[PDB]
Every structure is written in C-alpha cells, then in structure tokens.
RNA sequence: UUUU
RNA sequence: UUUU
RNA sequence: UUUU
RNA sequence: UUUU
RNA sequence: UUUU
RNA sequence: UUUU
RNA sequence: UUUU
RNA sequence: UUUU
RNA sequence: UUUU
RNA sequence: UUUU
C-alpha cells in the first residue's frame, strides 16, 4: 500500500510557506548570485523553521527583465547548492567564465556541487518586446542550514539560489520566490 | 496494511495539550461567543504551537450552569468555524435570532460556515436542581490560524468556539476546555 | 488453548481482599487527594501483602456527597499513579488549576504519569436532591510499593488514589473502597 | 509493507542532535548522578526542542578515568529514569548501598523505575594502564520533560542519566554524550 | 436435543409460589437482616414445600424508602447465604463495618459464604424525591432447609435474605418478595 | 496442551507441608470431633500460611485403636466441612444419632454441608488382634479460613476434621495427619 | 501453545530481589566459603521469603581483587550445593586439596553434590594491573531452606555459595551478589 | 547475471595505488586535520590520476601513538568530506568542541557534510603500554578533486582526511595510508 | 536411533575421576616432560582403574607461570603419546630442538607418534603481568597402560603428558590436571 | 564425487616436513628479509625434496620480540614471492619506504609480485609487556625452486619469506617456521 | 469456542 | 530431532 | 512462531 | 489502482 | 435451531 | 484483523 | 499423548 | 549461485 | 553430504 | 524481502 503512506504522512505535517520579492535590480555583466531559501529563519511563524532542516514540497520562481537604453539580454539560473558550507556561491563557481553566454563550470558540475533547476534567457528589445517574464514551478528537496538567521553563514546543503547575468548594466530585473515546505 | 500506518505515524508525533477555564460568567439573553482554540499561541511550550496549523486529536468541553434569583435556562453551543478569517463569530451568525430557543442561521449552516459539535440546554431550577453540568469529549480536526497571538485576528479556518445564551442575565455559568493536538 | 490458562492460573492464586471506608469529610475548594491502595500493608492476613507487589483483579469505589448550607458540587477523580516514588500526589499534579471545573494537568497527562479511572461530578441541591452517590467497579492492574507500612513513602508505581474537589467547604462527602487482588 | 513505513516516516522528520561534554571530575566514593538529556531545552535550534517530548533515535556515551595518587576504580552506570517527576535521581535510588561494588536497589529495579542501559567498571592502575575509556552507542526511546529549561525540575519520564562512583576521591573522570532525536 | 429437555421437564413440575410483604420498618444505622425464603414451610399448600429442598425458578424483590424528618439514605442488599447452618446472618457477616457506606466483608466474600444478588441504594430527599422504590427480578437457584417451620433454625444453604442499612433511624422502608419454585 | 499447564503451574508453587499427631485419646461413646487442618496458622514457615486460603494437594490420615479392658470398636470418620463458619462441628451434625453404628445425618448430607472422605471402623479384640491401624492418602481441595490462629473460630469452608466414636470409653486411639498444600 | 504459558505464569508472580555486599576481605591460601543465598530469610519484605523454597530467576555475582605487598592470585568459585543439609560447605568438599590451583574434589563432583556455576581466576600484579574484577549473570534454579533465619543451619538443597582461595594472605577481595526470585 | 559484471568491469580497469607516511608528529590538544587522498595528483604514474575523479576500491590507515613525559591519550578520526570545496577541514567542523573527548559537530553531521570511517582512541601509559597502534582497512568510494596538484584547493567531494587530537602536546604519533583506486 | 545409544550406554558406566597437582617447578630451558594420566593406577577407588585400559570422557589442564628475577616465557605443550611403550617421552621427541621457540619434531609428528592437544605460551613480565595462567578443557580418548603402578614403565598408547620449556631457569610454574573417565 | 578425490590423492602422498629456528636477532630500522622455504634442499630425507617443486599443505610461523634498553616495536611480514628468480627480496621491494610504519610498495603489489600472508606488529614495553609473540598457521601453495642447495639463487616462484623491521636496533627477535608439504 |  |  |  |  |  |  |  |  |  |  505504498505511495498511499506518502499521502497520509504529509496530511499530518504542516505545509509552511515562505514568500520573497526582489525588485528593481540592475542587469549585471559579471553576474550576481541571489539567495532564495536563506530567508527562512529559525522561529515559530508560518514562514520560519524549527531546527536546521526543512523539506521543500514545491517552490516557484518568477523572473522578469526590462530593457533600458539598449536592447539587452537577461539570464537567470535557478540552482541548488548541494554542498553549501555557509556561503553565497560566486558566479565563477557556477559558470566557466563570468559571461552571460558561458557554459557551466566543468569541475563543480562534474562533482555535482550544484544541481541546475532551470536556466532561462530573456532577450528584451527596445524595438520589440522590451519586457519579458517567466514563472517556473518545481517540486523541491531537503534543505539543510548552518545557522539560525538570514545571513550567508546559515546557508547549508540544499540551499536554493538564483544567478543573474546579462550583457548590459542598465536594464532592470525583478524576481519573486515562494517555497512550500514541511518542517517536522 | 492501512490504518496501521495511522497508528505508527501518531506515535512519532508529540501530542501537545492545552487547557482553559472560564468561570463565573453571567447568563446572556442576547448571547455571547467564547474562544476555545484561540488560546494556543505560537511558542515552544507544551500548550503552544509552531506555525499556523495544529491538528486536534481530541478535545473536551465542560459546561455548568447555576440558577440565581430565578429558575432559568442555559444553552451552550460548541462549534467549529470552518471559514474564520480572523474574528470571533457573532451570535446572529450562528442563530437565526438572538434568543435561546432559536434554530440555526439558515444561510451560514447551508453554506457550512459552521459545524455544530454539540448543542446543550441546561434548565436550572431554584425549586429543584439549581446546578447542572455536562462534559463532552469528541475527536478533533485541523485548526488553521491567521496570526501568532491570542487575539481575535488570529482565529482561522477550523477555530473552535462556544456560544452561550439563556433566558436570564442573573444566573452564572462556568466552562473549561482541553485540546490534545499534534503539531508536526 | 490460551485464555484458558489465564483461568487456571488464577484458580491457584488466593484472591485477597482489602476494604476501606472514609466518612464525613468536608468538601474542599482547593481539593485533596485520598489514598486507596496504600492501606494494604506487608503482613500475612487476607487484606495484607507479601513483598512489594500485588495485582488488583478488580476494585470498587463508592462516593457520596451531601449538600449543607448551600447547594454545591462534589467532584471525585479516581486515578492510578503510574510513576509514584513514595508520595501522595498533589491536586495540582492532576488538575491544571486547583478548581473543581479544571481540566487535567497537560504535562502529567501527556507523559502518562497518571491514568484516570473515573471522573465523577455530583451536584447536590438543597432545593432538590441533596444527597447523591455513585459506585464504580473496574478491573485492576499491578500495584508496586516502596515500603511495608501504610505511609505515603510506601506508595509506588500503580498506586490508586482519589482526588476530591468542589465549590464549597461546608458539604460532606463519604467514600469507601474495595480491592480484590492476587499476591503470588 | 510494514517496517518500510517506519523508514519513510523518519525521512520526513528532522533528526536533531545534542552534544555534551563533562571533563575533569573527581572520582566519588559516595557517588554522583549526572544529567545527560536534561540539556536539551525548549527552543528552535538544532540541539533544542519544541514541546515537552522528543524521541531519541540513538545516543552515545563516552566515559574515561585517570588514576591519580593511587590505583583506583571508576564505575559508570548509564540509565533511563522511566518515572522521573522533576529531579536528578540520588545514588541510593539506583544502588542498594552507596558503594562502587553495590548491586542495584531491589525496590526501584523491581518496579522498573529505572532501566540500566550500560554498567561499566574501569580499573585504572598507576603501575599499569592508568588511563581507560569506553564508548557505547545505543538506540533510544521517548523522552518526556516537565519543564522548558535545563534544571532538575524539567527532567521527566524517560530522562537519561549517568551515575559515577568509585573507590577513591582523587582520580579524575571525563564524559561526553550525544543524542540524535526526532521532535515531531 | 438438549435444552429442549429442560423445557419438557419443567412442564411436568408444579411451579409453586410464595408471596411476602414487610411494610413500615424504620431505617437502621446498624442495619438489619430480613428473611425472604424462610417463610416457605413444610406443608401441602401452593406456597409451602415437601421435604427440605426447593428450586427457585425466579424471584422478585420490591424495596421502597420514604424520608422522614431528614433527607436520608436507604440501602438494600439482596443476597443468598450459600452456607447457612440455621441462622439469620448478622450485618457484620455481610459488611466489613456496620455502616451504610461499607464494602463487603472481605473474608465471607472471599470464601463465597454469600452471593450478592443486588445492592441498591436509594437517596430520599425531603426537598426533592422523598419516596423511591426499586423492583428486581432474577432467576433463582436451589434452596436447602434445616427444619420444617418458619424459624431461623430452618434456614439452610441457599437461603435468601435482604440486608437493610441507612444513615437515619427515622425514615421508613417497605419491601415485598415473591418466589416461584419447583418442589419435585 | 491442557493438563500440561497444570503440571507447569505447580512447579512454580511451593508445596508447603503440615504435620500433626494426636496420641493416647480415650474411645468415646458419644463421640468427639478433632481438628486436622486448623493447625495451619498464618505465618511465614513451611507449615503455615499467607492469607486465609490454601489448596491441599494431598493429605494423609493415620488412625489406630487399642482395646483395653474389653474388646471394642473404634470408628473414625475423616470429613470436609464445606460450609464451616468458624466452629468445630458437633457429632450430631455428622451422625443421625450419637452412636458408633449410626448412619449420617440426613439433612446435613442432603445439603452437602459435609463431604465424607473416609469412614473407617476398627474392631479391636482382647482375644485376638487388640491393636489395629489404617493409613489413608487422598488428593485434597481448597481450604478457606475465618481467622489467623489455631482456634475454632478460624475454621472455614473446606476445613478438614475427623470424628471418632466407639462402643467403650476405656480403649485408646491415636491419630496423625499430614497435609501438602500450595499457598499462592 | 507451550513456552507462552511460562511467560504468562511469571507475569502473575512477584519477582522479589535480594542484594548483598561483602567488601575488604583478605585473600586466603587455605580458602574460605561465603554464603550468597543464605541471606534471604523468612519474612514479608521484598528481599525475604515465605516458606522454605524460592525459585531464582536470575542471579549475579561481582568479584574483585586488589594486590597488596606482592603480586598475587585470587580465585572465586561460584557454586550451587545441590544437597545441603544445613551447613556452609568446607573448601575441601569442593577442591581436591586446599590450594588455589587444585582441581575439584573427585568424589563430590562425581555424585553431583555441587554444580559449578563459574570458576574465575584473577591475577593481580603490582607491576601491572593490580586491580581486577568480573561480573557474571546467570539464570537460576530452585532453592530449598532448612530454617527461617540467616544461619548455616538454614542452608538447604540448592543453596548458592562462593569459594575464595588464593596464593597470598595480604591482598584484599570484594564481592557483591543479587538474586531475583519468585516466591509463590 | 549481475554482480558478475562488476567483477568483469574491474578486471579491465587498472587498480592504481598510492602510499603515504607521516611520522613523528606531536600530540595536539586543539587537534589537527591531516590530508590523506590529497597526495594523488594529476599525472601518468601508478600513484597519480587522470582528470579530477578516482574511485577508491579500498584504503588502509595505520595510526600509532607513543607516550612521552606523561601517560596520555591519542585520538584519530578517519573521515570522508562529502562536500569539500577546496579546503582542509578544521577541527571544529568535525568536533563540537576542540577537545579529545568531544562528540561530533551536531550541524555538520546532521547535514552529512562528513562521514566518519573510523574513530580510534589509544591510551598510552608510561607505567604500562606506552606504544599502541591500529590498522584499519575499508572499501572506498568516489573521490572528486578541484585541482591538479597536492594543495588544499584541490580537495573535493569525497576527499579523505584524518583528525588527530589528544590530551598532551608532548607525545608523538605516526600514521601511514594506502589507497587502491581505479581511474577510468 | 543412534547417538541416543551413546547417551544410554554412558549412563550405565561409572565416570571415575582423577585429580593431580604439581606446584612450584622451575622454568626449564632444556625442557621437561610431566606425566598426567600415569597417576591412575590399578585399584578399586574412584581415581584408580581395573585392567590396563580406561576411556577419558574429558580432561582439564591448568597451567600457571610466575616470572622471577627476569621477565620470561613459559611454554606448555599438552599432548597424547599414541604409541607409548612404557616411557616418559623426551623433549627432543616432541620438539625439533630443545628450545622454547622450536617447532615440532618433523619425524614423530609425520608418523603421528604424538597428537598435540594444546600448545600454550605465557609471557610473564616483571614490568607488567608477572603472573599468567590458562585452563583448557577437552574431550578425551582411550588410554592404554603397560603396567599397574605409577611408574614410567606403565605408560602406554594414549598416555597423556605435558611438556614445559622456557627461556629462563628462575621462574616458577604450577599445573593441575583432572581426568573424568569410564572403566568398563 | 569431487573433493573426495582430493582426500584420497593426499593419502597416497608423503607429507614431508621441514622445521627451522632463527633466534636472537636484532631489531632492524632499515629492515631485513629472512628465508623460510629456502632451507628445503634437494635430497632424500623427510625435510628435503626431489626435483624443483614441492606443494606446501600447511605452514606455521612463530615470531617473538623482546624490548631491550627502550620500549620498541617489531613488525613481521610473512609473504610469498610469486615471481622469485633466484634472490632474497629487498625490504624496498615489499615496502614503499624502509620504515616500520610504511605501507606496501605500490608497484610490486599491483603486479602481484608478492602475496602478503600475515602482517604482524608487536609493541614491546619496558614499563609493561616487554615480551610478545604470535603464532600463525595457514594452508600453503606450490613452491618452485631454481636450484638444489640452500642459497639465494635457489629461491623460485612461490618462495616463502619473512620481513622484519622495527623502530630500534637494540631489541631482540626470534622466529621459527614449519612447512608440511607433498613432493610427488 | 469463549468469560468472572 | 539432537547434546554433557 | 519464539524470548527477559 | 494511482496523484497535489 | 433456540427461550419463560 | 482492527482501535485510543 | 498422558501422570505425582 | 555468490566474492577480493 | 562435506573436512585436516 | 529486510536495515541506519
């Protein structure tokens, strides 16, 4: 009667929820890495956690880019850091070179330091569609923490991040994120 | 091997417990609505909760009425507000009219805004049995909250209440309540 | 051929018996805890014991309340102290608050320090039935002792008690108890 | 499909962990009792707890003795107090007499007030092996608490302790303990 | 074809009948024991017997209490004396102490000297129900006699009695009894 | 696997033993009744008892008669008093008339007040065999007591006795008795 | 359903317990014999007995030796005297010669007068491990007594003893013993 | 025909081998972490590797401690860093506190940052065995690297290390290590 | 029904027993051979024999060594001489060379002149454990004799011996032996 | 009927035997390699061989170390040279470096030039056990020779050796060896 | 078959 | 069924 | 099914 | 039967 | 089939 | 087999 | 299989 | 059939 | 049936 | 199939 137990088990666990929004950021040619799961801190509220582990049932990422001054490209890489030891990964840890066209870092991907959840490229044209967006929903996994508060040192194995990189410094991008998780 | 899993699952979950007492209240001809599950606030103690959900395994209500000056009637309606959005329901939401003999509000019951758990009427006579009481134990259900503290705004879908209404303002009634719940 | 062995085994064991009576006690608003199984002391008579263990086959409690001066309530809680280390439990160990309407202590009940055998409330009215009584018979369990004589220090795991609490200090209550036990 | 459910259930529960160390204590001829599980207090961190119950999946005790001045014996008794009501057990509750060679208290063991997890005796010789140690790992059980903080009054049914007793007051002993537990 | 024979056998045996009434007796604090089956004496009439044995097919007891001067309690214990040697049992043979709240005599009940058929307690209140009654019908058993006439010396193994005891000497009680028996 | 359990149960129960001797008694024409099981009193020794019940596994009676002055007859009736209420039965309770040739009392035997274990008559001749004896061994049954010491009032249901009666007052008889019993 | 009955039978029997300690004894070249089960005397306490038989469920012996002045050997022979008639066995009854290296007495072992439970030899060196100890736990058997008190004359078939013998008179040895037994 | 393929596959792969020795190190009270697999660098020799991955078939660790000046303890923890990002782990990452008696770091073990292969404690006594050693052989797993040379930055997921910590700074310890691995 | 006959046969045969002790012997660098079974001579006692054959059911050897002046080694070789013709074997018959480190004589072992039962080496250190011992129990075989008395000429096929050899002449060794045999 | 043939075949082949002893050698920090099977030369005696092949059925090695001046370590590596071409292997052929803590030579072990039979390390302490020994017995294999006499040039594929290496030059070690072989 |  |  |  |  |  |  |  |  |  |  397997799989039916999975259903019953989850009906006894509270599905806590955490929402985040990050608007009006500039496109970055050298790229940046944004925290997504870090915001769930130790506490008793619906968007907090008990202990240093949570299990994401599902999470959703919404990304948006707006071209300014020149038509440009925005790339967003949603990823899981399977081996985080209390840091916010650098762009070069994920990409071979710090360029929006770069392929993944051969070494970190070989050893599975990261798992790419979604890699999205939005081309925003000032002579066409200057505003573009994408929403992605995916089932989640375990998230471990190394601390209680919303600081880099608290990120742990399973931490969720988003790398943004593009070919201009003038355009603006927005993002929002939601995680539904159990905390038993 | 179903139903056996239900047993095992619960053996791994702490059955927290919350107790409440509300003594020496006056009988109300227009009625009043008392909070029962609201008292379980966010915290780490045995009678508190993590997050905004708990699952009542069982709960018990004890009601008592004492006639004073004149023989009178005390009515106690134990109910669940399946759709609470952060309030303490009014008497008229539950009863068609604000009278101890009234039937339920046709509209709120049709839409199942409330689920009546037990409706008890105690007739206390100053020429007979002037003191009467009733204890009721029932299995519970999920309780959702809209906030962390013991205020009306924190009541949510599944909140438990008790409406008291009678035909005099002089008699005194007492009540106590216990909820055994899991908080995983 | 199980269950048939249970029958045969008991036919070879003497079913000793102990009787107790406790009349004319005042109702207590703060409550009191009375000893029931403590009276079976080490000795060779029919109502005594060899060693520090006996197995209650069945026991019976008779409680009675009589209103005096004012109509009042008498509550009697028959219980087993599963973890007694040589004491007579306090009222607050059993009840959340020292009030006749109180629910059980959340902590001691969660950990199963006590097992409630029967909780009886008698409302005695001087304008109605001023005298009320209740007799309850139940199968018993193992009783461990921590000493040889009838003192608090001899109570042990499985000791049987009765808590009495009410809303007046003037009424009078009576009780009697019988335990049928094996002592092999 | 039993036993497989046990596996799945635990994969959804955070296995919190608590570590403790107690170094440089003097050997005691009258003995002492040390707290082991008491240190897990109410809170939101990885080594804390929600409510008054936790379930130890596994725990480990490390004991060490060093002879000083004279060759001597160190005894360590790892035990569970199945009936703790908010205390640190005394040596005489566990041992018949307060001597390192004593057998267990007949009464408390008969009634199963305690469950002995491991009884270790280390003989440290100043003409041989003056330093000895032992590490023991065992599966755990439920632990109930009677309070929120790290004080004796918070110990409850299932509390874990270690009794140390020897034949000298001069030697030094060290100990450390780890508990892996679920807190759902 | 068993059980069918039981039916046929009884159709060939006369079911004799004996009726008795005992009205206007005072409540007794020290108690009294009344004869019920003793009245069936040797003779040829419908309510008499041949020899020293009869077999009660069924018998019925009706008890009634009326409070006088003060609200009071009436207790009636219907019992069979399995070992009567020509006497009317004393109150202390049946009850541990001569008090209406007393439990049964441990020794006589252990050895099964008596079999309790019904134990009834009626609380009569001068501020409520001052008159109460109870009728009980039960299948009977063999009754042996030690003599021919209606005197104590004629009671024998199986004799039926009723013990009455209360908390006042002023109230009045009434009783009546009927026995349907075969006399083959 | 029945009957095998009977064997195992008894291997766990101590088979206590009691021995008695009664020598040099005169033959009695009116008869006398001697106590046999009464001598087992409350205590902790091998020939004593805990409580008011024992179960005789087996018992043995040895009787002897010696004619003196004239050839004469000695009768010994070994019996169980199934309904003893604290007495030593009289000769007339057992025998129709107080004569060594008498048949049993019709009334007491009809109601099974007594169970005859063995009825022995020894004719001792001064011109032949002047000395005669008989030893009888039989399985036993439950023995109930009404007190702790070796007095008549302690005899209870199941008590064992021996009636002696003859046709002369001059001859001498001796007897001895042994009871093997469990006392669980 | 055998073996299951053994389990059930024992659940109805009190497992009494007796503890003993014997510290600071000198090593003996001619040997000595110590009593272990003799200390359980007739009485009503948890470490006493009813009658002259008990059944040891399990027993444990703890022996310890400490070299003094010279490195030396301590031998401890735990044994059961299957035929004790009220004595403390002599060393020569157990050993062929009174020497710590001796083999068992050929005659007493051939006839099974004794059953060796454990034979332990501890070599304590003043240039190495000067302190050594051994704890042994074993299931027990029936123990018969010849008297009520703790004197040699009370030892009987099944009595438990410990013989100590070594190669010096200066070293010191300690021992402790526990017996868990039924006494039905 | 599974498992047989595993055999055949390995017969086609060269089992390269790497040996290391680290002698004459001082005991460390704050502890140190030594590299074991780091020494396998990129190259074409038998003890080198192609690429950034190797699969250890088996590896062996030999540890040794020698007491100097004072009797002391040496602890060696052989472990795998499952998430290494180019570092030599610190003592505090593995142990809760920097003490030889400390339990593991609760956080890093919860998230499985490390896998303990073997935890060995050697007590070296200057009055007994001053020199002690232990050799351990275990099957291995995948080893990922982050660089080509023997520097900390080259350690990667699966890197093998050994933590040494003790209670003195004077004693000396030695170690050696061998890894047999495939490099296909 | 084989093997069951072996059991029955032996129950009809007396298991005679012989004990021996040999204390305070000096360690021998050239070695010595001691007689073990030779001591069983023709006679009628429990430790003697009828005829020239006995069958050892079981035998036990206890050896002990004590270092004196210098730390040294004691070797004890328990063996059976399968072909003895009336002698005490020489050391060179058993060992290739007369040295405590020597392997067995190639020729005598090839032809199975001897069967080695146990070869024990005890290293006794004056800076550690200066006293060591070993007890060995083994099933036996047939023993043939060539004479009636305890002299070398009486040893025959199957004779049991013990060779002792060491690296010093100063240490002292002790031994004892027991043989349980049938003599039908 | 396989495996049974192996038994029969060997019963027709002489099991020749060779014994060797090598006493009083100094511990070597650079190590040495000793010959074990080389001593079996061409000839007709029981410890010699016909031709250049023998098959070792079983062989045994006995090693011993004695600390002198300083506590020290002795390592003994019993091995088979599967590819010997007429030499006594060097220490560096077997060990990576000439140190007693060294792991095996990666190259020679990879190619299976040697097969390690047993690797033993003995730590001899002048403050504890200064003398230690180990005896190892193992089944053997084919042994090929390259010559007729006991010189290095005669060693061939399968030759047996023992490498000794330690951390001092002062201690003394002894060894002995036996080989049982067929020579058909 | 089960039950005080 | 097997075992001292 | 068996076990303290 | 399976699924959020 | 069972039951007063 | 099912149940707090 | 049954029995003190 | 399984295993370094 | 298997084993030195 | 079972297991941390």
UniProtKB/Swiss-Prot annotation, chains A, B, C, D, E, F, G, H, I, J:
It comes from the Viruses. One of its GO terms (molecular function) is RNA binding. It is found in: Virion. Binds 3 Ca(2+) ions per subunit. InterPro entries: Satellite_CP-like (IPR005597), Satellite_virus_coat (IPR010392), Satellite_virus_coat_sf (IPR037164), Viral_coat (IPR029053). One of its GO terms (cellular component) is viral capsid. Ca(2+) 1 binds at residues 14, 44, 50, 53, 127, 183. Ca(2+) 2 binds at residues 14, 44, 127. SUPFAM superfamilies: Satellite viruses. Keywords: Calcium, Capsid protein, Metal-binding, RNA-binding, Virion. CDD domains: STNV. The keyword ATP-binding does not apply. Ca(2+) 3 binds at residues 14, 44, 127. The keyword NAD does not apply. Its cofactor is Ca(2+). Self-assembles to form an icosahedral capsid of 17 nm in diameter. This is Capsid protein. The lineage of its organism: Viruses, Riboviria, Albetovirus, Tobacco albetovirus 1.
């Amino acid at each position: 009667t397997m799989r039916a137990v999975k259903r019953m088990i989850n009906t006894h666990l509270e599905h806590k929820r955490f929402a985040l929004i990050n608007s009006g950021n500039t496109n970055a040619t050298a790229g940046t890495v944004q925290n997504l799961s870090n915001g769930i801190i130790q506490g008793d509220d619906i968007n907090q956690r008990s202990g240093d582990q949570v299990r994401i049932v599902s999470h959703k990422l919404h990304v948006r880019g707006t071209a300014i001054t020149v038509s440009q490209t925005f790339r967003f890489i949603w990823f899981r850091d399977n081996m985080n030891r209390g840091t916010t990964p650098t762009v070069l840890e994920v990409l071979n070179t710090a360029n929006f066209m770069s392929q993944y870092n051969p070494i970190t991907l070989q050893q599975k330091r990261f798992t790419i959840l979604k890699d999205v490229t939005l081309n925003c044209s000032l002579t066409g569609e200057s505003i573009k967006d994408r929403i992605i929903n995916l089932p989640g996994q375990l998230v471990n923490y190394n601390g209680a508060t919303a600081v880099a040192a608290s990120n742990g194995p399973g931490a969720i991040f988003m790398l943004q990189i593009g070919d201009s410094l003038v355009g603006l991008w927005d993002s929002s994120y939601e995680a539904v998780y159990t905390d038993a």
